Design a protein around this motif. Structure first.
Motif, PDB file in Angstrom:
ATOM      1  N   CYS A  57     -66.802 -40.990  36.341  1.00  0.00           N
ATOM      2  CA  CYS A  57     -65.894 -41.744  37.244  1.00  0.00           C
ATOM      3  C   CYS A  57     -64.508 -41.091  37.379  1.00  0.00           C
ATOM      4  CB  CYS A  57     -65.721 -43.207  36.771  1.00  0.00           C
ATOM      5  SG  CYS A  57     -65.595 -44.461  38.091  1.00  0.00           S
ATOM      6  N   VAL A  58     -64.474 -39.763  37.418  1.00  0.00           N
ATOM      7  CA  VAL A  58     -63.234 -39.040  37.655  1.00  0.00           C
ATOM      8  C   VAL A  58     -62.823 -39.208  39.110  1.00  0.00           C
ATOM      9  CG1 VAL A  58     -62.089 -36.837  37.638  1.00  0.00           C
ATOM     10  CG2 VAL A  58     -63.752 -37.391  35.871  1.00  0.00           C
ATOM     11  N   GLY A  59     -61.595 -39.649  39.332  1.00  0.00           N
ATOM     12  CA  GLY A  59     -61.117 -39.799  40.697  1.00  0.00           C
ATOM     13  C   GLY A  59     -61.342 -41.187  41.258  1.00  0.00           C
ATOM     14  N   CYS A  60     -61.915 -42.074  40.443  1.00  0.00           N
ATOM     15  CA  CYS A  60     -62.152 -43.450  40.826  1.00  0.00           C
ATOM     16  C   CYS A  60     -60.852 -44.207  41.026  1.00  0.00           C
ATOM     17  CB  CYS A  60     -62.994 -44.178  39.757  1.00  0.00           C
ATOM     18  SG  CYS A  60     -64.650 -43.516  39.614  1.00  0.00           S
ATOM     19  N   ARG A  61     -60.769 -45.035  42.059  1.00  0.00           N
ATOM     20  CA  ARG A  61     -59.552 -45.776  42.299  1.00  0.00           C
ATOM     21  C   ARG A  61     -59.847 -47.253  42.308  1.00  0.00           C
ATOM     22  NH1 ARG A  61     -54.658 -44.905  44.546  1.00  0.00           N
ATOM     23  NH2 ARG A  61     -53.840 -43.130  43.348  1.00  0.00           N
ATOM     24  N   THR A  62     -59.015 -48.004  41.606  1.00  0.00           N
ATOM     25  CA  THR A  62     -59.189 -49.452  41.555  1.00  0.00           C
ATOM     26  C   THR A  62     -58.040 -50.133  42.273  1.00  0.00           C
ATOM     27  OG1 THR A  62     -60.412 -49.369  39.486  1.00  0.00           O
ATOM     28  CG2 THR A  62     -59.383 -51.462  40.094  1.00  0.00           C
ATOM     29  N   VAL A  63     -58.366 -51.001  43.233  1.00  0.00           N
ATOM     30  CA  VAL A  63     -57.327 -51.692  44.007  1.00  0.00           C
ATOM     31  C   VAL A  63     -57.429 -53.203  43.824  1.00  0.00           C
ATOM     32  CG1 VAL A  63     -57.733 -49.863  45.702  1.00  0.00           C
ATOM     33  CG2 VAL A  63     -58.325 -52.208  46.274  1.00  0.00           C
ATOM     34  N   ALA A  64     -56.263 -53.848  43.800  1.00  0.00           N
ATOM     35  CA  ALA A  64     -56.155 -55.297  43.672  1.00  0.00           C
ATOM     36  C   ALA A  64     -56.271 -55.940  45.030  1.00  0.00           C
ATOM     37  CB  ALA A  64     -54.839 -55.680  43.036  1.00  0.00           C
ATOM     38  N   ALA A  65     -57.490 -56.257  45.429  1.00  0.00           N
ATOM     39  CA  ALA A  65     -57.720 -56.852  46.729  1.00  0.00           C
ATOM     40  C   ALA A  65     -57.688 -58.369  46.580  1.00  0.00           C
ATOM     41  CB  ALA A  65     -59.039 -56.400  47.285  1.00  0.00           C
ATOM     42  N   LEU A  66     -57.650 -59.067  47.705  1.00  0.00           N
ATOM     43  CA  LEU A  66     -57.853 -60.501  47.707  1.00  0.00           C
ATOM     44  C   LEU A  66     -59.187 -60.775  48.325  1.00  0.00           C
ATOM     45  CD1 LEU A  66     -54.346 -61.706  48.823  1.00  0.00           C
ATOM     46  CD2 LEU A  66     -55.273 -61.380  46.527  1.00  0.00           C
ATOM     47  N   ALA A  67     -59.625 -62.020  48.198  1.00  0.00           N
ATOM     48  CA  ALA A  67     -60.904 -62.425  48.755  1.00  0.00           C
ATOM     49  C   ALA A  67     -60.851 -62.458  50.282  1.00  0.00           C
ATOM     50  CB  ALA A  67     -61.309 -63.788  48.192  1.00  0.00           C
ATOM     51  N   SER A  68     -59.651 -62.598  50.833  1.00  0.00           N
ATOM     52  CA  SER A  68     -59.462 -62.643  52.273  1.00  0.00           C
ATOM     53  C   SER A  68     -59.451 -61.265  52.928  1.00  0.00           C
ATOM     54  CB  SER A  68     -58.159 -63.354  52.591  1.00  0.00           C
ATOM     55  OG  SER A  68     -57.128 -62.657  51.942  1.00  0.00           O
ATOM     56  N   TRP A  69     -59.344 -60.192  52.141  1.00  0.00           N
ATOM     57  CA  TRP A  69     -59.398 -58.824  52.698  1.00  0.00           C
ATOM     58  C   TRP A  69     -60.724 -58.544  53.374  1.00  0.00           C
ATOM     59  CZ3 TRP A  69     -56.783 -54.173  49.678  1.00  0.00           C
ATOM     60  CH2 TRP A  69     -55.462 -54.540  49.326  1.00  0.00           C
ATOM     61  N   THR A  70     -60.704 -57.748  54.442  1.00  0.00           N
ATOM     62  CA  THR A  70     -61.950 -57.204  54.976  1.00  0.00           C
ATOM     63  C   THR A  70     -62.220 -55.796  54.438  1.00  0.00           C
ATOM     64  OG1 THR A  70     -60.849 -56.210  56.838  1.00  0.00           O
ATOM     65  CG2 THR A  70     -61.680 -58.460  57.129  1.00  0.00           C
ATOM     66  N   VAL A  71     -63.424 -55.274  54.670  1.00  0.00           N
ATOM     67  CA  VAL A  71     -63.749 -53.908  54.276  1.00  0.00           C
ATOM     68  C   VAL A  71     -62.772 -52.939  54.960  1.00  0.00           C
ATOM     69  CG1 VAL A  71     -65.420 -52.015  54.470  1.00  0.00           C
ATOM     70  CG2 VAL A  71     -66.178 -54.337  53.777  1.00  0.00           C
ATOM     71  N   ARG A  72     -62.428 -53.246  56.198  1.00  0.00           N
ATOM     72  CA  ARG A  72     -61.429 -52.469  56.926  1.00  0.00           C
ATOM     73  C   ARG A  72     -60.065 -52.428  56.192  1.00  0.00           C
ATOM     74  NH1 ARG A  72     -60.202 -49.140  61.663  1.00  0.00           N
ATOM     75  NH2 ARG A  72     -57.901 -49.127  61.508  1.00  0.00           N
ATOM     76  N   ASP A  73     -59.631 -53.572  55.658  1.00  0.00           N
ATOM     77  CA  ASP A  73     -58.405 -53.638  54.858  1.00  0.00           C
ATOM     78  C   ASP A  73     -58.480 -52.721  53.631  1.00  0.00           C
ATOM     79  OD1 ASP A  73     -57.254 -55.557  56.578  1.00  0.00           O
ATOM     80  OD2 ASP A  73     -58.135 -57.213  55.429  1.00  0.00           O
ATOM     81  N   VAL A  74     -59.639 -52.677  52.978  1.00  0.00           N
ATOM     82  CA  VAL A  74     -59.758 -51.822  51.795  1.00  0.00           C
ATOM     83  C   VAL A  74     -59.580 -50.373  52.250  1.00  0.00           C
ATOM     84  CG1 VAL A  74     -61.299 -50.985  49.943  1.00  0.00           C
ATOM     85  CG2 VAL A  74     -61.210 -53.434  50.482  1.00  0.00           C
ATOM     86  N   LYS A  75     -60.180 -50.027  53.385  1.00  0.00           N
ATOM     87  CA  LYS A  75     -60.064 -48.666  53.882  1.00  0.00           C
ATOM     88  C   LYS A  75     -58.598 -48.353  54.212  1.00  0.00           C
ATOM     89  CE  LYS A  75     -64.670 -48.129  56.000  1.00  0.00           C
ATOM     90  NZ  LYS A  75     -65.252 -47.943  57.354  1.00  0.00           N
ATOM     91  N   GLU A  76     -57.920 -49.319  54.836  1.00  0.00           N
ATOM     92  CA  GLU A  76     -56.518 -49.111  55.204  1.00  0.00           C
ATOM     93  C   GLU A  76     -55.690 -48.887  53.947  1.00  0.00           C
ATOM     94  OE1 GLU A  76     -54.825 -48.650  57.870  1.00  0.00           O
ATOM     95  OE2 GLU A  76     -56.127 -49.337  59.529  1.00  0.00           O
TER      96      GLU A  76
END
Length: 74
Positions: free
Chosen positions: A12-31
């Motif tokens: 898992c080198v280069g893995c990124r963890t983001v604090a999303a909310l349940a209201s985020w869309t997949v598009r938001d994660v990409k943004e």
């Protein structure tokens, strides 16, 4: 005795963890990935369990579970 899929990562080198909310869309994660890395949203294809994730899918609809998505080319 119920089944548990276990996925093992060799590193898992280069893995990124983001604090999303349940209201985020997949598009938001990409943004947010683009904001953090410069990797262009247009080139991002996010995959989960072998299936590509549509942009409009709500993150909260996908689970509480730790969500793992695979950013893959093409």
């Amino acid at each position: 005795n119920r089944w548990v899929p276990v996925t093992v990562l060799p590193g898992c080198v280069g893995c990124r963890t983001v604090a999303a909310l349940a209201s985020w869309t997949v598009r938001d994660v990409k943004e947010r990935i683009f904001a953090e890395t410069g990797f262009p949203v247009s080139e991002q294809r996010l995959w989960r369990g072998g299936r590509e994730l549509s942009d409009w899918i709500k993150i909260g609809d996908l689970t509480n579970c730790h969500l793992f998505v695979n950013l893959q080319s093409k």
